[PDB]
Amino acid sequence: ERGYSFSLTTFSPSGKLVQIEYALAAVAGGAPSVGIKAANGVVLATEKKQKSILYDERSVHKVEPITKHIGLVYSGMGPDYRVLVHRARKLAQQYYLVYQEPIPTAQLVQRVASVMQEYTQSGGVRPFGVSLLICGWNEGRPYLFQSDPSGAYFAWKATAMGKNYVNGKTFLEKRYNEDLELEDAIHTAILTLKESFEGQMTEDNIEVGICNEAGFRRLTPTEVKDYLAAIA
Amino acid sequence: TGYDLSASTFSPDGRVFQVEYAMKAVENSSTAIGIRCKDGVVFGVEKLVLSKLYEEGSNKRLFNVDRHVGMAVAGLLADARSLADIAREEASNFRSNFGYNIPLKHLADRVAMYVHAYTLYSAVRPFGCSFMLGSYSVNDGAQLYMIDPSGVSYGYWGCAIGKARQAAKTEIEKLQMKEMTCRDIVKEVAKIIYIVHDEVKDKAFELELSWVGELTNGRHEIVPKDIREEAEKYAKESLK
Amino acid sequence: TTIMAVQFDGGVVLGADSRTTTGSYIANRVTDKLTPIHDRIFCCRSGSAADTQAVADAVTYQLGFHSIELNEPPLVHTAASLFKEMCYRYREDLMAGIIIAGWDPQEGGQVYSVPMGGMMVRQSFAIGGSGSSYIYGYVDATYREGMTKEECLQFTANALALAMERDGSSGGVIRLAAIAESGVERQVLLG
Amino acid sequence: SSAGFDRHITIFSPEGRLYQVEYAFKAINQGGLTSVAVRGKDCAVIVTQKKVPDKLLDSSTVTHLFKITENIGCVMTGMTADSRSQVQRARYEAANWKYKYGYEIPVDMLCKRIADISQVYTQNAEMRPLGCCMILIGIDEEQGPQVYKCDPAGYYCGFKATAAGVKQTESTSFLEKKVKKKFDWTFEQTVETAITCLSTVLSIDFKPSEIEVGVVTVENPKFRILTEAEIDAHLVALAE
Amino acid sequence: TTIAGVVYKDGIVLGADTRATEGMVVADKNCSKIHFISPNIYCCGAGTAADTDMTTQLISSNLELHSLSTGRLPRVVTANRMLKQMLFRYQGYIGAALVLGGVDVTGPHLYSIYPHGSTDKLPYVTMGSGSLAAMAVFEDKFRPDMEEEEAKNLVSEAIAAGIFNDLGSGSNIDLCVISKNKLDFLRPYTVPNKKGTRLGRYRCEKGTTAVLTEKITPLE
Amino acid sequence: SIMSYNGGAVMAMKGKNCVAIAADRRFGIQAQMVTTDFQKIFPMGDRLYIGLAGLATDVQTVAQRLKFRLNLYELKEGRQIKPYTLMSMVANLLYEKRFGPYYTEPVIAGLDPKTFKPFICSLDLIGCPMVTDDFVVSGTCAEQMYGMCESLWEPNMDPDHLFETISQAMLNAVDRDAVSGMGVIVHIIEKDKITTRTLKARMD
Lengths: 232, 240, 191, 240, 220, 204
Description:
The structure is cut from a larger assembly and holds chains A, B, C, D, E and F. Chain A is an alpha+beta fold. Chain A contains six helices and ten strands. Chain A has one domain: 4-Layer Sandwich (Glutamine Phosphoribosylpyrophosphate, subunit 1, domain 1), CATH 3.60.20. By secondary structure, chain D is of the alpha+beta class. Chain D has one domain (1-240): Aminohydrolase, N-terminal nucleophile (Ntn) domain (Glutamine Phosphoribosylpyrophosphate, subunit 1, domain 1). Chain D is built from six helices and ten strands. In chain D, the strands form two sheets. Chain D has a five-stranded antiparallel sheet with strand order 8-1-2-9-10, covered by helices on one side. A five-stranded antiparallel sheet of chain D has the order 3-4-5-6-7. In chain D, β3 (65-67) and β4 (72-78) form a beta hairpin. Chain D starts with 18 loop residues before the first helix and ends with a helix. Chain A binds chain D through residues 1, 4, 8, 19, 22-23, 25-29, 52-56, 59-60, 78-80, 82-83, 86, 119, 124-127, 129, and chain D through 10-18, 108, 112, 115-116, 118-119, 122-126, 151, 153-162, 172, 175-176, 179-180. Chain E: GO terms for molecular function: endopeptidase activity; threonine-type endopeptidase activity. Chain E: It is found in: Cytoplasm; Nucleus. Chain E: The active site is at 1 (nucleophile).
C-alpha cells in the first residue's frame, strides 16, 4: 500500500472516544449469553438459533476451548470472533513452550486484552465487535473474566452479555448467591437463558460448556436434552 | 454519485462506478474486430490517420506477445503498451519454468488476474483498455479471447471492440465461419471494417490485418497486403 | 543403489534395488526407490536420501498444482523440466541422481536423465546409481530396438540382477513398474 | 445516519452497523443468476444455469462449476472477476494443506481458511471486500457428503439445501416445504428436487442446454461435471 | 542409548533405556527417553539430548494446535511431515534421531527419522548407539502380526541386548504400548541391574568438620 | 578447555525436608589466582537458590539475564516462581544461544513455595534439564565429586548430617583438584530458616 498508518480514532471535545462506544452497540445487538461462577466450577451457556430449518448445528460451535482447562464464549458478530480465538490459541502455546506449564486464566486475559487494545490505537483499522467471557479452574479456585472491545477486562461472579442483558442483570442478582454446585448453576443458567429465548427450547437451540477441576468440557446434546428434561 | 471516487468503495446498490466509468472510455476508441476460422485467427483494426504527419505504420494497435500470440488493443494506447509488456513478460517465465509455449487459456487467466488487481485498491485506478488474444496450435487448434477492464475473460468466435461494437457483430454472425479457410476470411474482414464509417465524421483511415494460423505454420505476423492489395480491391466493391 | 529405465512402444519400464546403506551397514533392508509424482509419471532417485526425498516432494507440489490449473494431464517433459530447475540452481548443495520416466498422451513413453550436474537429456534407456558401472557394458550389447513389454521386463530383471549380485551397496529385492496408457503395474520380484 | 465516513469505509456506524459489507450482500445480485445445492444422501448435487445471449460467444468457456481439487468442486455467484480470483486462493491453499500436512484437506477446513481471507478485507480498510459467494461440496470420510457456503463478510456455515444468487427467499421457502418430510434420497430424488425447485422459482421448464450439474457420490468420489446428453436423461425422467 | 519399536497385530510397542552419559561418565541413572506427542502418538529420542527435547515439544505444540483447530484425532503422517521438513532446513545441524509411532484411523504406523531429514516406514526399527545389538534380536525373532505379550517380550529382550552391550543403561527398560483404544506407559518394567549394598561403617560426627563463620537468617 | 579456564565446582544435595548447596571461592586465570571471594551462588527468591560454574564471564552474564526475566515474571504474577518453572526458564535462555552458547552449567536447588518439598536439578551448556533425587554436581572436578557422593549419601537425613555429608564431600574432592579451592561456602536452607556457613579449607 501507500503506507499511511494514521489511526481512525481521536478524542472528542468532550473527551470521549466515539468509535469504541459505537462498537459496544454492536456487542449488545448480538446473541445473548450468560456465565456463572459456582463453588466448584464455571458454567457458560449461550443461545444458538439457526435462521432456518436447513442449517446444521454440528458444524459451527459457540462454546470454544482454548486449552484443556480454558473455554471461551462471546456475544457480538460471528466472523470477528474467529480471529481472536486462533490468536489466543497460538498465544497460549507460546507460554507453554517457555514455561512448560499450562497458562493460568488470569495471565491469558492479560495478553488477549492487549491484542484487542492494539486494533484501537493503530492505523486504519477498526476495533472488534466482540466481547468475551473466559473461564477456567486453575489452582483450585475457578475463574470467570469478561473482556470488551475497548481493551479493558473485569472479574465477574455472574454476568450476562448480549440482548436483554439488563434483564439478566436483575434476574441473576435475585437468583444467584455465594455458593452452589455446578448442577445448580446450570439450572439457573438455563432459567436466565429461558428469559429471552424463542417459544421452544430444545437440545439444539442452546449450547453449554462447563469447567470441572478435571478440565474444560462442552456438553453434547444428549446431556442437554436430559438436563432440560423438565428440570424447569 | 458521491460514492464513486475510490475504486475501493461500493455504491448503495452494490457496484463500483470507477470500473463502470473506465469501460466507456474504451467505447470512444476506434473499432477493432477479431474472427477465427477453422484453422486460424484473423485480426483487423480500423485505424485513423491523426493529421498527415503520421508515418504509415506508426503507433500500431496490433501487438505481438509471443511467438504465436498477439493482441488487438483498443482504448488508451499508452495504457495498452504497459499492459502488453506484462503479457510479454508472463510468457517468458512460463518458458523458463516449464520449457514449452504458453497455452492461451492459461495466458488469459494470468493477465486477467493482473487486470483484476487494479480494480480493488484506492491507490491505483482500473485500466482503460480492452483487447483480443489469438493463437493457433496443432494440439489445440485456434482460440480467441476477450478481456474487459473489469477482468472478465472468456472465449468467442468473433468479436468487436470500439464505437461500433454492436454494429459490427450484427454482420459477423451472418458468416459461416466454422468451415471457411482464413485466406477467405481476410477479404471478408476487409468489408466489415469498410462498411462501418469510412469517412463520415472522420477524414481518413488505414487498415491493419494481423494473421495467425496453420498457413503461417503457427507464426503470428502481419498479412502481406502490400502483396496483392486484395482487401481494398474487394471491400470497395460494396459501394453499390 | 542401481536404477533402471527402458522405454518401449506402449510405455516405459522402471526398476531398482533397495539396500539403503550407511557406510558399510544396511540401514533399510527394503526401500521404495521409485516414487509416484502424478498418475502416469514416476521417478527413481539416487544419491543422498534426504536430498532426493526433499526434491521429489517439491516437484509433486508444483506439478500437481500446475495440472489442476490447466485441467489437463501433465507432460513428462514438463516434469523433467522441474527437476532440472531445482538441481541446477541448488547445485553445490545436493547430490541427486534423478531419472524421470512415464507415459504421456501426446508423446507416449519417454525417459529422461538428470544426473548430479543438472543437465537433462532424453534417452531410449537410462541407468544410474553407484552399481551402474558394472552392468554398463552388458546393457548396450543386449539392448535391441523394438522390444515388447514382456521383453523389457525380462531385460531389466537380468540387468539389475548382475549389479545386485556384484555391487556391495546394491542388492536386496527387485521392484519393477510398467507404465502405459492403461494403468500402472507394480510388482516385487526376486531371481 | 451518515456520521464521519461510515457510508464510505469499513468503520462502525451508530447502532453498531457497518454498511459497506451489507452493500456487498446485494453486490451479488448484479450477476443475474441463481444457484442451488442439495445434500440428501450419500451424494451431493450442484445445479446452476448458464446464460448465453450471443451466438458468437462460446459454450465451454462459460461454466461456473470450478474444480478445486479432485474431491472438491464449487460454484460461484456474484460478479465474475472477483469470483475467479477467489477460486485461485482455494486451489492454492488446498495444495498447501497437502504439502504441509501430508493428506487431503477436508471440505470443512477449507471453508474456514477462505472465510479468514475475507475477514482481513473486512477488518482492514482501503481493501475492497470481494463481492462474490462460494458454495462447496465434497465427501468426508466417516462424515458423509457436505455442503458449505461462505459469505463476503467471512461468515460461513454448512447446511443441507442451499440457494444463492437472486432468488434465495423464494427457493429456500420451497426447500423447507420440500425437505420437512424425510423422504428417501436415492441419487435420483436428489437431482429431481435440485432441478424442479429451480424450475418452479424461475418458471422456465428449460431446454437441456442452459444448466450444469456438478456431482460427487460415494461410488465415484471424484468431482464430476455432467454431459449435455445425460442432463437430458434426467430431464425427460421428470417429465410427468 | 538404545531405542526400538515394533508393529504387532493391533498396535505398536516402543522401548528405550535410562542412561545419559557425558564423555565416558554416567551422568544420569534414570532419563526418560520416550516423549509425549499426542494421546495416540509417542516418540523416542536419540542423539543430542537437548536437540531432541526442544524438537519433540515444538511438534507436540503444533499438533495440539492443529487438532484442536480441526476437531479430530491427529495423523501420524502429519507428525512425520512436520519433522522431516523441519530437520532438512537445518541441514543436519540439529542432531536428532527419532522413532515415531502411533495409531491413526488408518491403523498403526511406525517411522524412523534421521537428522538430515530422511524417513523410512518399517514394521520394526532400532536407533541409537546400541541399535546394532537390538536389531540382532528383531532380525532373528520377528514374525508378522504377533500378539500382545509376544510383542512386549520381544522388545524387552531387544533392549536388554543393548544394555549388556556397552553404553547400555542403569537398566530400567521402558515400554509404551499403543493400541486402538488402550494406552500404556511403564517406566519400571524390568530392573535387572541392582546396585550392591554398602558394607562399610561411615560414622560421621556432629562436629567433625571445622567451621570458620556461621550465619543464621530466619524466615516466615 | 574453555571450561577449564577458571575452574569451579558447584554441588547440590537433597535432604529430608531441607536442601543444601555448596561452591568454592577461588577466582583466577588458568594458573594464577586473583581473589578468594568470587560469588557463584545467587539467591532467586526465598528458599530457592542457583549455582553457576564454568567461564566466569558467562557466570556473571547469565545470572544478570536470569534476574532480568525473573523480576518481570514476579510482577505480571503476584505469586513467586515455582522450582520447575525456573528450570524451564533457564533452559529456554540457554537454548536461544544454540550455536553461540554460554559456557556455564547451572545447578538449581530450592524448596517448594507452598509445600516443603525439596528440588534439585542441573543443566547442560545448551539446556538439557536433569532432575534427580540425591545429588547433582557440576564443574571441572566432576569425577571427584561423584566418587564422594555415591558413598556418603543417605536417603533421609536431618539438617545436621546433611551438613556434614556435603562438607566432607566438598573438602575431599576439591583438594584433589588443582584449579579449585581457596575456601568453600555452604548454604543449607529449610522451611524455617537459612544457614550459611564457610568451612576451614586448605588455602594452597
